[PDB]
Amino acid sequence: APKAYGYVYTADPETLDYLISSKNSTTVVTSNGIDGLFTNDNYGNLAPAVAEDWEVSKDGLTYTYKIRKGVKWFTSDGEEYAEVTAKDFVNGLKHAADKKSEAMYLAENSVKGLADYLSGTSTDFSTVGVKAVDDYTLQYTLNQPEPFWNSKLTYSIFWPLNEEFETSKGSDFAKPTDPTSLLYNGPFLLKGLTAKSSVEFVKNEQYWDKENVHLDTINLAYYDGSDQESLERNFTSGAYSYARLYPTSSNYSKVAEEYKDNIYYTQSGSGIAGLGVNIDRQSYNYTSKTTDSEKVATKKALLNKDFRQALNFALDRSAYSAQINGKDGAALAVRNLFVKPDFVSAGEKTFGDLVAAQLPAYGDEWKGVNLADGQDGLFNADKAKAEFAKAKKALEADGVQFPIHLDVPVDQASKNYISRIQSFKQSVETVLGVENVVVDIQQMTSDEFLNITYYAANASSEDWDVSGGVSWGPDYQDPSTYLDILKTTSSETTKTYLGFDNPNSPSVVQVGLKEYDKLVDEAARETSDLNVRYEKYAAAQAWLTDSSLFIPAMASSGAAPVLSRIVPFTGASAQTGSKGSDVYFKYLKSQDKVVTKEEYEKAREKWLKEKAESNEKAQKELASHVK
């Protein structure tokens, strides 16, 4: 039935603790059940959720939220527990601080006093700038004005948590197979968790905003990538409400004929997929290298910027994207920049434009660069070979023997991840020569792969030389959400994308990341002129692009052919945060029949007009909240 949403999830959560986790697998299982102060409506506006109203001081430092009365916490079986209050947001942030949240970067330099509490120089949380002035008045005090502060409040570190419940559960709190170990205040109740099988929700029939909830049930089935045709097959049977299509499937010509009037393409998402370079590899439990000399050679090569540039310029991103999208749709998903090029603009210039204007200082090879989505602006075999020749001269003078062996891990279950990594291998080896670079693909089980990538505990666990296993999506509406996480001090995220968690590692200094820190920090200090702030963050992105420490390849979502029974443009629209329709299913409506491309385009053209007007009205209302 249309009120029974069915689709898939790709990884079992390590935790249900939404305050501590920075991983989408926790968002997938909690957002539908946990509301914070705002959501996102179908036009992308912030919509009142637990905050019924808000104000900001004239100096921009104090935000005050009127907590909606009558919003309740419920158990997984629908029993009322307590009333959501401002004290739950004080407790949420204290819990995030005390248990060292993986997402603390969003809050630690923003909320007054929080950095001192995290370091231990203050142990009294009353010195931290979150206060329950009364049970329905929540006040945050910031270190500096942040026009993007409210956009942070759709991210999970600012969600509420009832302290009495948390204390009552002890070490059983937020356990990943136990829906009774959280309480729910959102549009759905988390009902079922079965490892490698399902995530299950039911509509919260006592939800204050249930008039905006149009699904009775949500069921997500585990999908490990071993059968990419499974999505379309289960869509056709009616089990799934949606299906991402893979044109490389052997049955695709049949699918494309049957659904010729229904397949449509989604817009590219804001997250970035690509290949991180481990500049400080600690462990060799997944390697093809046979000698310590090869290990030393690879470590030295990965510290060489020209070597990394050679890999970056040798990667054919269209062919990489074609492994999941086919050749005809391949270019749509290509991305050339860590920050999505139009994520922000300074007047008429996109962020990508600002980066392109600063990149040529690093070399004439960047003059004329096209950083726009939807085309491969970085692939250039001639430039790849030229950079490699410089690297090889420098490395051979230091005793390094060639070829350089690169370990890239894959989950043996995900066929089209293997195909993507094989395309990387073919690109690099054909352009640069197998006498120069050998890509050694390390096959392992799904759990083994997660343990050295997505769920790696520390830098010692990042057992790889190059890896495309983990993407990054933006958490709030400012370039810092992409660029701050690669600073030398951002150890929770530097391990994932760059292999290090020691801010003082000599590998980190050798690749110049201290200069990156200073560029990011100079941008962060600009709070009086957004255009200048964005120009300064573009300087940091230009450094990152030249450094080739992360090899961008594609948007991490979107730019894909899909089938749908979801009524077009009814779901939440979010470019950042945890309340987009990928994870949060308020507002969404389903229909009986498969959506047609004509239905979708008609809705899109009306939505674009309505969104522009709605966003403009919202912007004009901002000043009325200044008190």
Numbering used by the authors: 33 to 659
Reproduce the article's own wording on this structure:
Given the auxotrophic nature of pneumococci for certain amino acids, the Ami ABC transporter system, orchestrating oligopeptide uptake, becomes indispensable in host compartments lacking amino acids.
As we observed in the case of AliB, the analysis of AmiA structure (solved at 1.50 Å resolution) revealed an unidentified electron density trapped at the substrate-binding site. Considering the precedent of this observation in previous reports for AmiA and the identification of the peptide’s nature, we modeled this decapeptide reasonably matching the observed experimental map. Surprisingly, our analysis identified a total of 356 distinct peptides bound to the AmiA protein and 393 peptides bound to AliB. AmiA predominantly recognized peptides consisting of 10–11 residues, while AliB favored 11–12 residues. Notably, AmiA exhibits a stronger propensity to accommodate a negatively-charged residue, such as D or E, at this ligand position, a trend also observed for AmiA’s ligand positions 4 and 5. AmiA was solved ab initio by using the Arcimboldo program SHREDDER deriving fragments from a template with 26% sequence identity.
